[model samples]
Target: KENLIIAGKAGPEPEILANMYKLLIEENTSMTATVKPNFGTTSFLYEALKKGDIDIYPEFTGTVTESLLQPSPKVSHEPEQVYQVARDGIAKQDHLAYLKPMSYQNTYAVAVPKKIAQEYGLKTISDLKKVEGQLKAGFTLEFNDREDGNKGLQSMYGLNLNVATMQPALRYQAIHSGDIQITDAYSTDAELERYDLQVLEDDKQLFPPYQGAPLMKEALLKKHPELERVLNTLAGKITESQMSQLNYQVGVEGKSAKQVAKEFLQEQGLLKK
Candidate 1:
């Protein structure tokens, strides 16, 4: 039997999705699948795949286009366009392929304490203007630097506040400790629910779409063509809220990634109980 090694980044969501692929590939095909969760970052995973150290891993389209391919200037922020750019660019440049993306967009989000949101009636990013300079913000260094992040928030929303840079995990802790009133987050972050934080809507759509998909070496698919069909069963399956809840189960509730993957696939009728 063919043995497939799946890689995942260092996070609950990527690990969970990687396990899902492992379970699906093993059940639906004559393959033995192993998961290497928390393997590394996107660049590391891409290098591993190129070296044949891994067969597949979960990836986001926006990251691929903006960070990896980085062709001409981006013309559109629509989901399909972003996905196609990542898909076609990788396929042509690196002989890599991206499966159909899940329904959710894990784009950048701005989050605040639940109580603060309610007190200020902050329903969208625009609402932050009301409390500008009053609330302290802690963001990742990358977010603080990216155009699609704080820079865009400033230009598009015309709102700027005190900003500090912190690690992703520490930002959440800082917020809980009341050291920061706001922090940047991914749309499907589990901590949003764990910390009882509210995500402010991106009313201006400044962030690019970041739909997730299984990215793999094209040669692997050429040999096992059916693998694509089996994995694509998850195409457009998971929604943003559903992904966040799944992440919360593993990250906050302390469930194993394999268990969460199994239950979710069984619920979707993609796996046998």
Candidate 2:
């Protein structure tokens, strides 16, 4: 009933959210875009959602299962199952809704330069062990500290790289310039190719599924019932490759989020003008 607020954190990845904003506007939904200051973490964003500081924002299912709805026995790593759990938990526990998810899973990945891969024959996380001591890894501050992050990297793959915390913007630069041998990256980051970086496979499944979707306050959705239908039009719209290209366009190519989003919405036939 009141003004609609859709929030997103600062990142190259949130370009999709920008698209969602434009789509809602085209659909005649009265919504405003809000960007949280945090780049990778989700706690404060969820906190704001609970307090109604924001009505909606993009989120990851793996984050919901592994952290937000944890200490439970019914955790699942499968994408749909994770979405279900996230949907139910947030609705029951926080009065928020995790709508249908997008098609891509933007999970965490460890990236290496092409030469590192060729030298070590590194196809997976386990293979990184051979070059562990030789590695200097750069990661976002949260990934360097989270349980499913450096902790999982060490436990699952026996990789104890010399780790350093770096801003999200500079991680790729750190790797491309050989300042770091390995870096944490989102699986769908476009710069993976632009910077000639290769993402190591998580053969052991160290990280959880991170299928992205929108989360909104239940009250807001109930008040604006059409939002569910309008937003769900985005479900399964963006594939991993499409998202990577969009990220590349906005993140590396220095395009505006609105421009990238608007173009994609047009291409998808979700917007007419």
Candidate 3:
């Protein structure tokens, strides 16, 4: 039997999701599935898939457009619009297939300490304008420059504040220690719950949607056409809150991805007990 290899990005959320794919595929298909859960970045996974080093991986629609697809096309912030852009672009350019996306989005988000948010009465990103210069912001170097990050916030919301760049995890601690009052984070990050941070609504939808989906080479799908149906069963199953809680369990509570995936699948009745 041909073995299927699934790759995952370097994060608990992706790794856990990949394990779900592995479990479901193995249970439903005759083929055995293997998972490489700590596989590097989005670009690295895309390249590996093209080179036939891996069979499938979970990819974000926003990352596909903002980072992978060349000369990035202009697409609306709506989930379906962004998904279509990535789906069509991958099909036409690389012969890759992006299957249906999960219901939740893990896009870039602006967060503040819960107390700070309540104190400032900040419910949306635009609300930051009133306290602009009063807040010190810490952002990742990449987010500081990306158009869909700090740059987008500036252009779309017209708010500017003192900013500092730091490592991803460090920003969480920095904000907690009051070194910075604001930070950029992924919407599904577990730390948001850990630190009791409040994610300001992207009322302007400055960040593109980042719905996750199983991406694979079309040739592989053709070889085992049934694989598409099996994988698509997971589409629209996971919501943003569910994803965040899953991440928290794995990343913060120290649960294994295998354990979490199995439990979730069993609970959903997707896997036989």
Best by TM-score: 2
TM-score of each: 0.86, 0.91, 0.87
Candidate 3: misplaced stretches above 4 Å?
Answer: 119-121, 129-134, 158-163
In candidate 2, residue 74 scores what lDDT?
A: 54
Better of 2 and 3 by TM-score: 2
For model 3, residues 67-139, the per-residue Cα lDDT tens digits are 7788888888788989999999999999999999989989888999999999999999999999987999999
lDDT of 3 at 137: 97
Give the alpha-carbon lDDT of every model: 0.87, 0.78, 0.88
Scanning candidate 2 in windows of ten residues, the lowest lDDT window is: 32-41
Best candidate, lDDT-wise? 3
Cα lDDT tens digits, model 1, 148-227, are 77887898898787899887658988988899989998889888777889989988877778999999999999999988
| Candidate 2 lDDT (Cα, 0 to 1) | 0.78
Itemize residue pairs with steric clashes in candidate 3. none
Report the poorest 10 consecutive residues by lDDT, candidate 1: 66-75
Q: Residue-pair clashes per candidate, as listed?
A: 0, 0, 0
